[PDB]
Structures are given as C-alpha cells and as structure tokens.
Amino acid sequence: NDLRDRILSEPLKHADFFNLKELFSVRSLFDARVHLGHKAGCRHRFMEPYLFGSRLGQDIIDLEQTAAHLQLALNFTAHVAYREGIILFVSRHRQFAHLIETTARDCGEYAHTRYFKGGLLTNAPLLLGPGVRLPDLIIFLHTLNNVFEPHVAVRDAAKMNIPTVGIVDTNCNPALITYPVPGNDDSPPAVRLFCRLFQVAISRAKEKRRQVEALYRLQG
Amino acid sequence: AGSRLETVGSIFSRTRDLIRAGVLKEKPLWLDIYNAFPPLREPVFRRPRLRYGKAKAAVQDIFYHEDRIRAKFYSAYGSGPKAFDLFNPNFKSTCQRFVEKYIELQRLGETDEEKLFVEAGKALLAEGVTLRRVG
Amino acid sequence: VESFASMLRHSPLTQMGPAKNKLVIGQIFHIVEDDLYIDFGGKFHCVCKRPEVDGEKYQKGTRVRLRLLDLELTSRFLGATTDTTILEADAVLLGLQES
C-alpha cells in the first residue's frame, strides 16, 4: 500500500510528464481556424482579455494565450485520465455530435451530445441509479446549447464540485469553467483538432499508466 | 455531503475549506492535480453586468499599413483575377502582390502616391497578370 | 519560433480585407436534396441552391467558386442584448472551379 502512493505522486512532480508540448503549437492552431471568433456585437463581456483584436467586425482570438491555456487543459485531462478518472465529453451542437461520440468511444471515456436532462448531475442517485459514480472531469466541446444559452452541466459541475475543461468562443461565459480554452468551436477542423488532441491525451495517459503498473509489478 | 453554492467561490476553495473544516473525509482525486497545476484564473463566479455610460470595450481594431494600399486596390480594381484560396496557408493574392510591389517602391525613394500606385499597377504586368479597372 | 501576430498579418483572411463581393474557392462537404453546404473556408459554411445547369456535377467534395457577401449573418432586434447569429455565411454560386 505504501508503494501505491508512488504511482499517484510521481506525475505530480513533473510539469510535462506526458510530453504534450509536441502535440500542438501556435502554427498548428492557426491553420485550423481556431483564432477566429464571432462578430463584434456577439462578443461576451468576459471575452475581452482573451481577444487579440477585431478584424473588420469579426473578433480575432489570440493564440498565445490559447496555447497557454490548452497546455494546462491537456495536462489536467491527462493527469485525471492517468489517475483512473471518469471523463465525460459534453457538447450540445448538432453538427459534430457523432464525431464526439466516436472520439469518446475511441478514448474509452463517456459522452453526452444529446438533450441534457434536468437532474442528471444533481439528482444522480435518482436519474442514473441507486449508487452512481459521478464523472471526475467534464470536457465541454460546445459551451452554448442550441438556444445560445450556457449549458446546464456548466453550472451543475460547479454545483457538484466537478472540474470542467471547456472550449469557449467569443460569445461564451468562462466564469464557471475551471480550465477555459479560448478558441473556435464552429469550424469543422477547429473541432476536429481539439477532439484529436484530447484523444491523444487520454490515450497517452492510459498507456503510461499501464507501463507504470508494468514496472510496479517488477518492483516486487 | 458537500457545498452546492456556485456564486460563493470556486470549486477549489469550496473543496479545500470543507476538508479544512473536517466534513469532507475523502480528498477528491482532482484536488492534487489542481494543487500541482492550477489554472491561470480561479474559476470564481462573476455576474455579466451590462456596460452603461461612456464606458466601452477594451479591445482594439486590427489594422496594418498594408490595408491602406489594399483599400486603393479594392477601390480601383476590385477583386483580383485569382480567386481567394483560404485553404492554402501560404496563398498570395493579387492585392498581396500589389502591396509587395508598393512596399519596395516605397523603399526605392519614392514619396508621391500616384508615382507609387500607377508604377506598381504597371509593374504587375511584368509577371503576366490582368487588371480590370472598374469604371 | 513564429508569432501569432506575424502569421495573422500574412494570413489570407487578412489579405482579403472586407468580405463583400470577394471571389473565394469553397469545397462542398454536405449534400441535401436541393441545398449544397459549401465550405469557403473562413469561419462558417454557406448554403446555396443547386442551379439548373450542370446540376448533377455537384457532389460531395466538389470545389466551386463563390462571391462572398457576408462572413457571418448577425443582426440586432428589439430588446436584444447581443446579436442573433445565424451560424451561416452569405454567398452566391457562380461556377465550379473553372480551369
């Protein structure tokens, strides 16, 4: 039991323990239309510090802070996937719902791209089952629903003390999101880039966990 | 059980002070990762108040010196013959070639705008492209 | 390393300037019985009606020529705090990659 704490305490002492810096860069985010946001009138008030400027009406999201936030988001999701944490990909957007279900299936994590029920996270012991384990991380691929209002889980996770990583556009509200990533969530390649980044992050985390357990079996 | 208050503080503070008081006997697995790699801004709740009075946004417009020549190109010739290909990252349009000729004709010691404009308009014929002046 | 402002100054969307009456090559990525979802590439996808001539030549993956009118359709109305975004762009169909 004393050596079990070593497996959980090892990755906490390193910054890039899973080597996620090679996954992306500012040029890898630029060609995916990530730096593009909505118009100037659709700008949320809490998006001003995360913006680079306005290119003839359309707001431009800076990519330096985008990558600086994405590094922390990928590190956190890789660490929670390493510590055997339940990860739920939530997104209410009727264009990439199938892509998100397939990404969560290839990741071995869980997905919610359908109509989020009322008491799902709060009234879980009555909505899901008698005793249910709530997800240890919620990754939001679209913060707003089809009504252009903040999602229900973005508030229910903050109510249930569940960490939330979220891709926020120029019209989103990151006040309650634990790890916001200022980028674009409306272009197909921009969505696919984030889905593949989180895919490779969970894959590398589970693989390094299996390797650490392989050496755990040889340490005794 | 826990703290279901969203507007009081952040999830990290609400999970830390509960264990500090001794009501949360089990530490969540994400708390060590939050203590190790905290985000840039603490996820505290802030109400989106409206902006009244003379107060405006803090963002600035994106404009370069090349736009002042792109406006002359789009005012005189309009859209270039080569249509825009937004998929190519290194795509160079006719207006970009025009401003590339303009920035060097500026370095060649010329100040007059007509002597910087119609000479680049004639230099574009050296490559073999067509220009349609919109009357 | 390359800065984001340096790549954005030389990005083609910066070279295009205003999106009014601009010739853009866009690729179709979805097909509806009468509507064609063309991806001109900027932010959104424009939905155009299949013309009468050469209507069978428009398939998924076909690249066509468009005259961009608006990058994103947003407008304000009575008692609205923000705009009502349509999540679409406005452009007309002219041809299919003449070459």
Binding site: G53, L56 | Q60, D61, I62, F63, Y64, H65, D67, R68, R70, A71, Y74 | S3, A5, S6, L8, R9, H10, G17, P18
Partner: peptide
C-alpha cells in the same frame, strides 16, 4: 519589439456615406 502588430489607424475601407437624390442641390 514586434513589427507585425496592428497600428491604431483609421479605417481605410470606410465606404462613403450614401447621398439623397437632392444631396448638394437647390
């Protein structure tokens, strides 16, 4: 230190205001 930063200049693409049918008439 950066040279490719946008400069605070006026809008070059400012389209001229539309006129009435009797603008600048008598």
């Amino acid at each position: 230190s950066n040279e490719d930063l946008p400069v605070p200049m006026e809008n070059p693409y400012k389209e001229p205001l539309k006129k009435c049918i009797l603008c600048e008439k008598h």
